[PDB]
Every structure is written in C-alpha cells, then in structure tokens.
C-alpha cells in the first residue's frame, strides 16, 4: 500500500525536465513530452499578422513571455482543471493543478501526506486518459484567420484565466487574472495524435 | 540542503523501473511499470489447463503433453514479454553503457522473480538511471510490442509467428495464437497473454 502510493506520488508530484538537442524532454504522470526550443525567438521578435490578432500580448508593455516549458505546464494544469469539473480527490487535483500553474518547482511538496493518501493507480490512470483527451481536444481546434470562437479553449480558476489558442505558430498559451504568455509547437503533441 | 534536480530525477526513474505495480480491476489486472499501463486479462487459464490433460496439444507437446510443464499467470506472461524486450534492447548495445547493466538486472528481476519491487542496492547502477535511459527503454518496449503485434498466428505456410530471445541462462519463446500470445520459458514454464493487453499500443 505504501508501495503504490509512493510510485504514484513519484510520477504525479514530480515534473522532470532534461535538456535535449532539440529542446527539452519533460516527464510527468508517466507521460513524455518533447518540447522544442524554437519559440521565445519568434514571440519576442514580433513583440505573420498573428501579432494584430493578439495586441494584448504583442503590443502590451505589461505582457511577459515565458518558456515553452511554462506553456506545457500551463496546458497540463488546464487539463487538470478541466477534469476538476466533475470530491475529496477534487482537492488533490486542485493542488497539483495549482502547483503546475503557479510555481516553477519540479517537485510538488505541500501538502505531501494529505494528497499522498488519496493517490492510486486507478486515479493516475484517470488523470492520464483525461490529459490525452484534453490534448486531442486541443488538436481538434482549427487555426482560423480571425479570432473566432472555434480556435481556442478557455479555463478559469478562481484566481486565473487560461487561454490556449491554436495558431500557425502552434499553441499560443496565456494566463491572466498583467498577462503571461508563451508558445508550444504542435510537435510536442504529435505522438498523441 | 535538498536533493539536487538530478537526484529527484534518478529517484523517479528508479521508482518507475523497479516497481512492477499490479492492481485488480473488474476485467483482470492493470499493471504499471516504466510509466506504462497494461490491462491484462485474468482469463484463458482454463483452456491451457484443459489442453494439458487437438492441433494445439501436438503443436506444443513440451507444454501440453509434458507432466513437468507449469502453467503461470498472465501477469507472469507480461513480465516475461517485458524481460524479453529488455534483452532484445541490451543485445543491440555494448557493455560500456550503464544502460546495459540496468537493462540486464531489470530484465533478470522481471524474468526470474515474482517480487513487485526490485531491491536495487548497487549504488553504481542506481546513480546512472536517467530520464534519457527510461525514454529509450519505453521506446524500445513499445517497438517490441509492435513486433509481437505484427506476428501472424501460427499457420500452414510458415508466416512469421513467433519470436525467440535466448540468454546464457534462459530461452524465451513468444508465439502468436488465436488466443493471443503463448509465452514460454525454458532453461518449462508457460502461459497465455490475451492480445487486448497490447491493443492500445498498436
């Protein structure tokens, strides 16, 4: 029983990052993601008419470009928030989501035992299948000339709003109530589609 | 003050590779190893136990007409298949890699014991477990499962229907049948893994 809990905790409460020749490989919840390093370049450069579509990002002194890793973390947090829309485990999902969203630590700490007692393979399996579903929901999106309703997903915590938008440059990701944003290349999700 | 990033990573990789986590479900078992989930059916043992006392009985007399063969669980079959995939991997590399020692030890553990935790106390090998290594392992296991999936069911004109992996110490044979994969180990033990376990990876 200690065994299962520890195995699950190792996978769910650590967000591993390793540098590769292409960018980074990330490992979380037993899923690998390859994150390309191309990104900050284009975004910071245009700070390609996508610019005009997002003036609040590219023409705003109070916007902050984040790394592609940040973009992935935000997306995973969003997937979790998306499962959250569905009770004692609800708080665990909440805490892990919060940790992914708002911190940059690679290891989830507080509150160790509380959350840990709820961890199981069944729960991790649900988390993984829901994450893959959310990814395919992102993949379902259409790149569209204008803003449009059909090219983005929005999830809204009590303390944050996450917008993920599919563009010609890949997945533009933004977090608001100031604004933080980044870009995740579509390649990161290619293995799951 | 707190374990460096590399030490947390090594711990996580150790936990994924050295725990074979087995849980009961309504359909059989769900196994978790190397960050990979497998749904294993508990069924099929009756068939085997009957045959052991057709074309199948004579096709595998060492299993079915041998009072000294021993039927194992499907979990054992999966363990043997994973062990075999690791041997397959380690044969493509050279001893000069930490990955070789690890693949070997993990494979021996999965293949020859039933324990669900592998007490790896060679600091040497543990200190070289990495996300790169685990990634290579996962890649190769899925590649191996795809080689198994592309086997034809044993047939009249000898279309490739099995894979054999030989160690200094064991011989592992995995054969495609109408009932899924018949797995055997000789130095005889055998079982059957229903093919649904591999369906998600096709």
Swiss-Prot record, chain B:
Keyword Transferase: no
Gene Ontology BP terms: symbiont-mediated suppression of host innate immune response; viral process
Keyword Transferase included in the entry's annotation: no
Any Pfam family the entry gives: Filo_VP24
Entry keyword set: Host cell membrane, Host membrane, Host-virus interaction, Inhibition of host innate immune response by virus, Interferon antiviral system evasion, Membrane, Viral immunoevasion, Virion
GO cellular component: host cell endomembrane system; host cell plasma membrane; membrane; virion membrane
Main location (coarse class): virion
Superkingdom of source: Viruses
Intracellular or extracellular location(s): Virion membrane; Host cell membrane; Host endomembrane system
MF annotations from Gene Ontology: structural molecule activity
Topology of the protein relative to the lipid bilayer: Peripheral membrane protein
Subunit structure: Interacts with host importins KPNA1, KPNA5 and KPNA6. Interacts with host STAT1.
Known function: Prevents the establishment of cellular antiviral state by blocking the interferon-alpha/beta (IFN-alpha/beta) and IFN-gamma signaling pathways. Blocks the IFN-induced nuclear accumulation of host phosphorylated STAT1, by interacting with the STAT1-binding region of host importin alpha-1/KPNA1 protein, thereby inhibiting the latter. Without the activity of this protein, activated STAT1 would not enter the nucleus and be unable to activate IFN-induced genes. Plays a role in assembly of viral nucleocapsid and virion budding.
Family per record: Belongs to the filoviridae membrane-associated protein VP24 family.
Descriptive protein name: Membrane-associated protein VP24
Originating organism: Reston ebolavirus (strain Philippines-96)
Gene coding for it: VP24
């Amino acid at each position: 029983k200690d065994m299962e809990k520890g195995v699950i905790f190792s996978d769910l409460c650590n967000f591993l990052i390793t540098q590769t020749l292409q960018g980074w490989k990330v490992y979380w919840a037993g899923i690998e993601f390859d994150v390309s390093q191309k990104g900050m370049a284009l975004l910071t450069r245009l700070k390609a008419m996508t610019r005009n579509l997002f003036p609040h990002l590219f023409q705003n002194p109070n916007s902050v470009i984040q790394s592609p890793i940040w973009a992935l973390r935000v997306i995973l947090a969003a997937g979790l928030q998306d499962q959250l829309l569905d009770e004692p485990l609800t708080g665990a999902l909440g805490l892990i989501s919060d940790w992914l969203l708002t911190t940059t630590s690679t290891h989830f700490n507080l509150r160790t035992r509380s959350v840990k007692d709820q961890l199981s393979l069944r729960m991790l399996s649900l988390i993984r299948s829901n994450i893959l579903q959310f990814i395919n929901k992102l993949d379902a999106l259409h790149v569209v000339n204008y803003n449009g309703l059909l090219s983005s997903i929005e999830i809204g915590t009590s303390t944050h709003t996450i917008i993920i938008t599919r563009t010609n440059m890949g997945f533009l990701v933004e977090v608001q109530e100031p604004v933080k944003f980044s870009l995740l290349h579509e390649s990161a999700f290619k293995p799951f589609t």
